[model samples]
Target chain A: PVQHVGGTYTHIPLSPRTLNAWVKLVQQKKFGAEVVPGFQALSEGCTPYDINQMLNCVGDHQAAMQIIREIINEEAAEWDVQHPIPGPLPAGQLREPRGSDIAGTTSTVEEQIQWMFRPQNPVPVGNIYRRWIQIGLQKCVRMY
Target chain B: PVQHVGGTYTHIPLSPRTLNAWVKLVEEKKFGAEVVPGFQALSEGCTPYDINQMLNCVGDHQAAMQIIREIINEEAAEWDVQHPIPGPLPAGQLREPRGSDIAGTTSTVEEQIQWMFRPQNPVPVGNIYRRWIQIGLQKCVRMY
Candidate 1:
């Protein structure tokens, strides 16, 4: 055992053994979606069951949908403390949106959600990790 | 004739016969989806559905999983949002033995939303207008 420096591996082949374990890890609240998906074949192979487990692993679709729905309702629902749907930045309010602001003029709750659907916008990575099991498996081996 | 202003196209076609009378004056507000998909001559006639929609309208295996019973928990009683799952992020966050920000960095609430599903994400326009259809004949040439 040398404490001099760290090293790398030649090949890695540690995809998740099965969807069930993936589900468990999902529930245990320990997974990454974005980067994980980068390794997917870019094909749709996982089932909705995989999706549900993934969602349920950390959060359910209803909750996800609800949170999303609530985020949506923010624009539609009456004002309240719990649900704070910020209106347009007043005159010089909220730091004048932001340079990164993409929701330019699309004034609607639905629009905001739709924007999320765009990959560049902001997607839900947790779901991606679940669907793509190959990424996890790579850890088992060492392949650059 | 009055000058027409530029507007957004909500995936619907533009026509008069489909819209009917009276409301023809205010065509900016609403529209419908329509399409006469099917066999056409070989000369140069074609629809987006025949040429493009079919690609968008795929019956691939991944898509098929959408209706799987065990997947998509439409009836899930609760929303699952148990933050702090295990993984590279958590593993690094817990003890920080030795690594970099990229190594320890985990998911944020926003990232979670980003990966809910796979690359597809979820947008309204894609599903709304669909492969076929567009503004109808009555709506396009309404003479009321």
Candidate 2:
């Protein structure tokens, strides 16, 4: 119901990857793969956990932005979703359905990858975040 | 009850000026700002408002993280709140009491700034987005 994105992008800044990595790793507890999340000019939303880690990897601001765009494009290409969003998913798991594992055991790379492509539980494309973004894109496309 | 300077420095990666711009503009409802509640992050104990704005602006991704650190540094310099934490009353905001106003009536820059700085009567920080971040920081530092 309430949210806003702000940055040079001018509308709703999509957030970077370096910080997002930290947020996901230490905070949000998610991971970013090379091909799945695709790529961006520099992975702006989640910058890969540590700021220092990113600087070591990406370098400066301009370099970082380019990388984020790369991640976005990579991910967009895979899913056919709009930029700033994942691909449009059908119903089903998309990757894997919920309840695959209740225990705290780690998932295999193959399983995890499967989950990525399968559409994890309740259909992620239908999730509020993705849906909201998709609707925004549709409106924009219509305008043109 | 749960905060420190080192973590503040480490946790927030953006520049000071950018942080100030983010928060101030956010308060002013500049092209980017919007209204949100300050329930989550504020409850996390000793939270810094400036840090919150920086994280929110950056998001949990790559491009945002790098750009944020650079922007925050400048913002900090402007406010003279060195150490990147930039604490204390004078350095932060010498806020007045709380009150309300509509969007475009006659709110001065100073007035809007005041509201941005004002302490929430009930909440710890009163700024919701920033508060969420403070919550995460508090959790991490408590372990240290």
Candidate 3:
């Protein structure tokens, strides 16, 4: 049995257009669109229902944790995609089943594609965003 | 007559080492030490006495304003150095006296060199510094 660590997980709703643009830019090898596997996996697994629950906090911590687990599964699937084994491996060379493998098993390609087109809530800009902007301005001095 | 636009003037003490290193690096044409004429002129004119008054605020606003006037004179001198007129000009080409001209008249080269070696108060980092650091970190994300 694994021990649970105490932590809080928060989610921010991102527009489908924004996500599509980011993925497209990364595919095109455009500047400022560097590929980050973790971010890519998160985007792959994110769903409209998960974002809605995160915003509404329906079922609170438990619901968020479930979403987090789902995302982790997606991340694992991404890892497998990135690290492919050599061809001509025997049937015995097949990997053991892991919880994250469920990410691939649970969803069809058609469903995933439909999810990508779903509209998402706009990002909220509050005190946190303003504080981040100010911090960025000061650090940029070192760049030059 | 000059019209006064009221504003608050605040001074922060910087280490002599920092200033010297900055100037030296600039002279050496080191990377990340690109010169900004305004900043160079300000550093050229800054003095221990001016820094002391800025810290203690003995005469408050009036004292600070006086120091600002003195710095402006130094800036003017720097400007003259940067934008020198052709030599062998007639007496008619001599410019009229300006308030900023006093920065050069008030100090000799020896005094200026001595001032460079004078020990300065260490910088005080508080809430403002932390805020600035945080801002810098956020902006740096864009850089990568």
Between candidates 1 and 3, the TM-score winner: 3
- Backbone clashes in model 3, listed as residue pairs: A134-B135, A135-B134, A135-B135, A135-B136, A136-B135, A136-B139, A139-B136
Classified by CAPRI criteria, candidate 1 counts as incorrect
- Which candidate's TM-score is highest? 2
Whole-model lDDT, model 2: 0.30
TM-score of chain A of 3: 0.22
- Higher-lDDT candidate of 1 and 3: 3
Fnat for each predicted structure, in order: 0.00, 0.00, 0.00
lDDT, candidate 2, A1-144, per-residue tens? 002234211122223422333223222211122211211212222211211233332333333334443443444444433323244566763333222110101233233323333433422221322222223323322432
The candidate with the higher lDDT, 2 or 3, is 3
Candidate 1 lDDT tens digits, B45-137 = 222222222222322323322332122132111112222323455543332111111111232212222222124542221111221112222
| Tens digit of per-residue lDDT, candidate 3, span B78-103 | 65586565557468643322222223
lDDT of each: 0.24, 0.30, 0.32
Measured over all alpha carbons after superposition, the RMSD of each candidate to the real structure, in angstroms, is 30.1, 19.2, 21.7
DockQ of 2: 0.02
